[PDB]
Design a protein around this ligand. Sequence first.
Ligand code: CA
Ligand code: CA
Ligand code: CA
Ligand code: CA
Lengths: 347, 347
Amino acid sequence: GLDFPEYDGVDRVINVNAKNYKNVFKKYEVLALLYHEPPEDDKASQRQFEMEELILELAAQVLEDKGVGFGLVDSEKDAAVAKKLGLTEVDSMYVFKGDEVIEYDGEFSADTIVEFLLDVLEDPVELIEGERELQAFENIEDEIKLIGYFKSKDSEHYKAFEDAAEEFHPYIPFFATFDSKVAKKLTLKLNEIDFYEAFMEEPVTIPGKPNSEEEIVNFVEEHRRSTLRKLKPESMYETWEDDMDGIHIVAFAEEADPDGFEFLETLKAVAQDNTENPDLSIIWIDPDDFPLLVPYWEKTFDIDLSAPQIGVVNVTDADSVWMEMDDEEDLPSAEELEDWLEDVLEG
Amino acid sequence: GLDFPEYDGVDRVINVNAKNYKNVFKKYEVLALLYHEPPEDDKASQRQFEMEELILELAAQVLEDKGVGFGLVDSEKDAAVAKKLGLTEVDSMYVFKGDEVIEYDGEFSADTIVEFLLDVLEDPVELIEGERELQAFENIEDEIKLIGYFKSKDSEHYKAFEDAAEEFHPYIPFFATFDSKVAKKLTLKLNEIDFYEAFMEEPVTIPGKPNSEEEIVNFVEEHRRSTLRKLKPESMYETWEDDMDGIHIVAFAEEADPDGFEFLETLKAVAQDNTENPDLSIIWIDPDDFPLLVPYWEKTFDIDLSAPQIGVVNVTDADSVWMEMDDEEDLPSAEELEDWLEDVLEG
Ligand SMILES: [Ca+2]
Ligand SMILES: [Ca+2]
Ligand SMILES: [Ca+2]
Ligand SMILES: [Ca+2]
């Protein structure tokens, strides 16, 4: 209360080993384990890990009362514990809530770790009982949204829905309603599951009742990638891996600046036209959400980010081309984007 | 380019002393100096500073090509250099661009340090030559905006305006136009300076030409505090110090959630009514902008932050009272806020 919140220097991150990993597991609600190889002998690698340890130490302090634990499993000194716990990807964070395990693959900053783990602490299903709560659903525009209308929470169909909610927690939100009155506002019947793709006004309905736990999974697996995706720090690396033939379409637009405000809606219209093109993965990167990568992007691509930008980035060749633009000239329309997209299939 | 941006472990922060501080100064465009007392003998204080050093080390890596340097002046081993450089506030960061010196007093995270220093690297005066650029000015709603219409940049009146711009760089933005056509869109004559208070639609004009360098300062000094202020990480501590008789009015509203979207406009109307009340400092805190302080606020005040909240916080007594609210019930209007403000002057 009165104590101002600062990093107190108290070590909290647990050196997991074969003796305590059980006690540690049965101790915290959610346990975050960083599976790391031993840092090299040199002073620089020691400092890279020195920061990783601290970034976790700051998160361990923030989520102490919230029942979130942090541990470091050494790929060699704790090789046994990692084998049993199913720890494969070295230099990566695994998150354990109940039985489902999460291979965290976002940015490793104390900000993003905590927000992600806070979103892990809540329930997978987020119920709606009011219009003020139903208005929030209608505002979701930046990621994959899912809605399921059930008669009751105790019903068996909704019991397989929460089980199908844990497999994607918390990267894509799963909502559920038990009101028939809102079921008509969403064109959703009883046990009818609607699917909202990211940045898509008109949704896509899923097969009628019944829907098994295995059923709900396989549809998202086919539609996890939206035509347009916002780059989020909690998953910026899994998103960047998911490209089309080593080719990403990337849009630099600040959601706040008016130049970018129309640039996002000009962009979202392009994906509305070519959503029948599964080979089209375009990624919107809010520069206000990645302030540490701004000077590196401006230098790698020779651009100014104060002005919105768009181009094609080759992941395989590590090459990029960027639409030259004039700030005084009018912001190019969606026709000028696909006309410039004609120079994408030329090579 | 191809190298993925990670903290490389290379130490960059300079141990400033009496031998190199001149060479260091004449080396970087902007030099950030952390004036710190020597950490205590114990292992916890050593780790608190261990993180402070790293948070700077990450910023030194990001702004290396951008000509930004970082240094640690020890209040005892570099006591001479601190005396000459005018370093008074211990455990605080000083920023040196040219001759004006900045006592940085925001949050000490690598995110905020870099954005602040990037805003330091640009010019104090941000010129407008287009409508796309003039539309950005009209979108500024969260802080103090200033506009000055001059005939030419080479003019003497605009030369004292850039000199009056450095004294407030970069906490409040100073714009300047040389177009007479936009001067009519802002009700601003030749050498007429208009002042936009934060969250205030109708601005307030400043005395006509001439305006000295000393003149521009003293008006902002009287009007630096807006009736309503957004809590920004780059200055969250200077803002929290600036209270009214140990009393802050604080609003917890997420700018994205629809519940908070109307809660901010309900709030901004209240300040529009009582802007003639200089004793009224209310602070809006975007919970999406301070993710590390969320579990501490929810515990200190016994609230849920998913729902917007407002109350009165006593800085002197370290006490607070919060408007009890129902999520199903309608979001209280601006009349219910001042009616609940009646219970502020009762004690
Ligand atoms: Ca171990
Ligand atoms: Ca699609
Ligand atoms: Ca020294
Ligand atoms: Ca005022």
